Amino acid sequence: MEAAHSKSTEECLAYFGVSETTGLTPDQVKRHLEKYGHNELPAEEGKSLWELVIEQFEDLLVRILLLAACISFVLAWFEEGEETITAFVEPFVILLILIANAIVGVWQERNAENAIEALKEYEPEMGKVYRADRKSVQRIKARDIVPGDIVEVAVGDKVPADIRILSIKSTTLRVDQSILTGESVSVIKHTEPVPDPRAVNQDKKNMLFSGTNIAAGKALGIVATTGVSTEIGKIRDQMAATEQDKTPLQQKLDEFGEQLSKVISLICVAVWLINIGHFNDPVHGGSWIRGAIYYFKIAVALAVAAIPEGLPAVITTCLALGTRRMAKKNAIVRSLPSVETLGCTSVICSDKTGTLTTNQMSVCKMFIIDKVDGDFCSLNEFSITGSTYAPEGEVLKNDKPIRSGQFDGLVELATICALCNDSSLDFNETKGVYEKVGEATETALTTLVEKMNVFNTEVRNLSKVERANACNSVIRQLMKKEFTLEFSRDRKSMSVYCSPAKSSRAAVGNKMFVKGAPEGVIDRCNYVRVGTTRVPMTGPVKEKILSVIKEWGTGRDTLRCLALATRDTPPKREEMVLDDSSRFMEYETDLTFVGVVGMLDPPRKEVMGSIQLCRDAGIRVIMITGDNKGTAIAICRRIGIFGENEEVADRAYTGREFDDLPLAEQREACRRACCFARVEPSHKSKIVEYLQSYDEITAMTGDGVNDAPALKKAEIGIAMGSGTAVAKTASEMVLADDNFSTIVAAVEEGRAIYNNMKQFIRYLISSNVGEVVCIFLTAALGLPEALIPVQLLWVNLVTDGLPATALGFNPPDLDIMDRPPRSPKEPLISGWLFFRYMAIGGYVGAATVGAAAWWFMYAEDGPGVTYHQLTHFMQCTEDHPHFEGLDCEIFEAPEPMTMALSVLVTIEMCNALNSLSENQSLMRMPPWVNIWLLGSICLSMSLHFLILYVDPLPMIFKLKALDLTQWLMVLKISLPVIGLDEILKFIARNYLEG
Ligand SMILES: C/C=C(/C)C(=O)O[C@H]1C(C)=C2[C@H]([C@@H]1OC(=O)CCCCCCC)[C@@](C)(OC(C)=O)C[C@H](OC(=O)CCC)[C@@]1(O)[C@H]2OC(=O)[C@@]1(C)O
Ligand code: BEF
Ligand SMILES: [Mg+2]
């Protein structure tokens, strides 16, 4: 029965035809279960194990590389008894790699935690219903609850389903809805209908929502909806329907792949249009029986030379280590890619309650009377540190620690806080944290008492569990609590009647301890306490008290204030009627004012500094909360989102004010405003969406169910470690530590990571360009192969893979966080740099092919072959007379390829050093600025000597150790590449913007 909030209690009962006194009959339950299904959410099970392996082989470059292995297999098979000793070696490695990185992705993606299967850490286990079955309440599985069921809830209970309140048993019902609406103060409920069918959750004051918990009181109700029809149900589906795009970097890697794909085939067809001349020469060396093997011999060499086979490995290792470093900051990264995207964050949307704040009411100020003398009245004001329920913090006066117990006024204040209290504090040994028991605004008094420790009780040698009630327990032994006059909405105060306990003070008599909204309690005080004595309440005294209450109630403080008082001579229990709260106020009169306490849902300690760091990093911070605007703005002022006295006319909107704006203005408002209050879950998602429409990488920070949709839509969702299960499953990162400043450390980490990544991506892709130039050149010139796939794969994965990882450790710039976020559309390579890699690529191709040719034509120990008898080496056998002389197999010698590979390697070591800085000269930024890069080159080089000496290797790699005369040539060929780039950079700084 949606809309139950607008209907009366009788209407809701009639609607389901159920008796409020007995509950549904076992027949109606069976039928309602049938018509409404169980009270649970569907299992979110997607992508199994084999489903991941599939998508692993869907990458455009992988299929090309794979189809390249298939073609390599046919070749290894058609490999005659000339080199059939290690022919199938090529197809193997090509497939081995594809399987290596593959199983890696599966092992990587499999690591995950479900959203609905984990959401059961929020969906109550049990529920309490009355059913015709029996007279007593029944405790059943919450999943077995159906619409129409009569449910009972009491303090501490987790509401099992969306319920229409029928009857309130206690004097009032207070509900903590922070996990769902973001409200920071428990909500007083009622049973009357809420007319406006469009009333938002914060307005449904006659409804109880599944997932929330009872702060105080007891009530009976009728289930309105269950399963996916509940408020928490609507949000989950909302979360499930939101789509997420690929990371900007991943979109660039995909674009690269699509473009590279076009270039490959394009060159494949290009060479083809250079072999068409074969249909001119009069010679038949194999129609369609043997002669055709050479085309596909270069086609696979091209696809292998163009594709950075080692990139997937370098990137994963980089991101993985990045995730390790974050974990040391207690930041659990759920998605490896976001480790970097986080660096591109331009706007950080953040929930308020439980995210920007602790969501734990804290008393931070209090005062008692100091002295009264005529029109003069001075107060003893104190401040209290600590922003959670933990009994950890101090009491200060004029910013200095004092012993509360030395102020008799404070002893009575603590006493009232401890006794006039129906709640307590506890230590969850499981979660390892202190938790409230009952009402937050009461537990705040409990922890205040533990901090004050007015009797200096010994607490150093206590366990977390004992420390939670040590000082309160001591005070509870001083007086016997006879009864309590529960809080009432008209009176706005609560009191307890106490009789003397310990025989230590029997000449005291009965007392009444009162607390409540200041105005009404103070109006009912005829006396004011000063230390231990009492003076009459006079205009001047009342004035000073109210003026300080006023200050604390607004401005820089904006605290919730509570006045504390006691009735020195309370009525005899006999002359008091305790069954009607309408008489309580009168019993709470002729009181003696004792003091005031100011409390609030405090901002977490590191938020203010964090927001200032973001500002300098060009990152906006926007508050998006379900709480009322007054509290939203107040917190914004405390953390610096707004100036202490700034006017927020058009920089703070409520959900309604926002909706009253035409779409265009709404969109613009997201760029100007920083505080959105009284908003719904879809409002948060909407705001994120507007930000994203301006091409801004947005992050969202939350803790509750109402943050789940937005957390998912944001490029980077950040959930509080102490938040809900939903919010965490919807996030890429979790602050296990609840430290908001870790977000800034993550951004910094993400910026450094990305800058290094750009350098190694550039490095690797750069070498592929040169490699393709080498292949194309030889295929075009008709010359023999200078480099072969097996050699290219080893260099692309090891020789260059190691230095690429080292670049990942390049020291970050000192002003990394003193600059705006880079653009998400910023291309990794373009403009001048495109030309640089263009020139380097050409330089590598010519140098590698040239080195090979050199050995073939000038090497003092190679054949003195002529240029075109080398470009026509293919016609050696058949036409020996033309270009005769020597063995036709020398054209397949390992010396020339080794000469070419050694040049590729040496050149890449140099370009690795050119990759330390985009435009800085190696003289300005020395090679030793990254010790790792220097070592990686040593490792890569010694691995080269390995592949050239350990017999097995040089055999399968088609190589052979070169001579010192040949190496020196390799150096003279390679080294100059440093001079080339050392020049292109110079041209970029002086005559360009670099
Ligand atoms: C990997 C090796 C090679 C040789 C390759 O073909 O790379 C090209 C290519 C796909 C791009 C190019 C290469 O293009 C050329 O050199 C010109 C076209 C050649 C056609 C020849 C027809 C007979 C990069 C490599 O060239 C230079 C010289 O820097 C730069 C850059 O790459 C990046 O920004 C890398 C992205 C991670 C990309 O233009 C990129 O395409 C894109 O969409 C980008 C934005 O990506
Ligand atoms: F809890 Be959030 F402030 F909506
Ligand atoms: Mg919240």
CSV table of C-alpha atoms and ligand atoms in Angstrom, one decimal, residues 177-183 351-357 359 624-626 684 701-707 720, ligand 3:
chain,number,residue,atom,x,y,z
A,177,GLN,CA,16.9,7.8,9.9
A,178,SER,CA,20.5,9.0,9.1
A,179,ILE,CA,21.4,5.9,7.2
A,180,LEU,CA,18.6,6.7,4.8
A,181,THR,CA,17.7,10.4,4.8
A,182,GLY,CA,20.9,11.8,6.2
A,183,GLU,CA,19.0,13.5,9.1
A,351,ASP,CA,27.5,13.5,1.8
A,352,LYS,CA,27.3,15.3,5.2
A,353,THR,CA,26.1,13.0,7.9
A,354,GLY,CA,28.5,10.2,8.7
A,355,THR,CA,30.8,11.3,5.9
A,356,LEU,CA,31.8,15.0,6.5
A,357,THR,CA,30.6,14.5,10.1
A,359,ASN,CA,27.2,11.3,13.0
A,624,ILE,CA,25.0,17.0,-0.9
A,625,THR,CA,22.9,16.0,2.1
A,626,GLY,CA,19.4,14.9,3.0
A,684,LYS,CA,22.6,13.3,-5.6
A,701,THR,CA,31.7,10.5,-0.9
A,702,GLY,CA,29.1,8.8,1.3
A,703,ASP,CA,28.1,6.4,4.0
A,704,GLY,CA,24.4,5.8,3.7
A,705,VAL,CA,21.9,4.1,1.5
A,706,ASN,CA,20.9,7.5,0.1
A,707,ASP,CA,24.5,7.8,-1.3
A,720,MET,CA,33.2,5.5,4.7
B,3,MG,MG,25.0,10.2,5.4
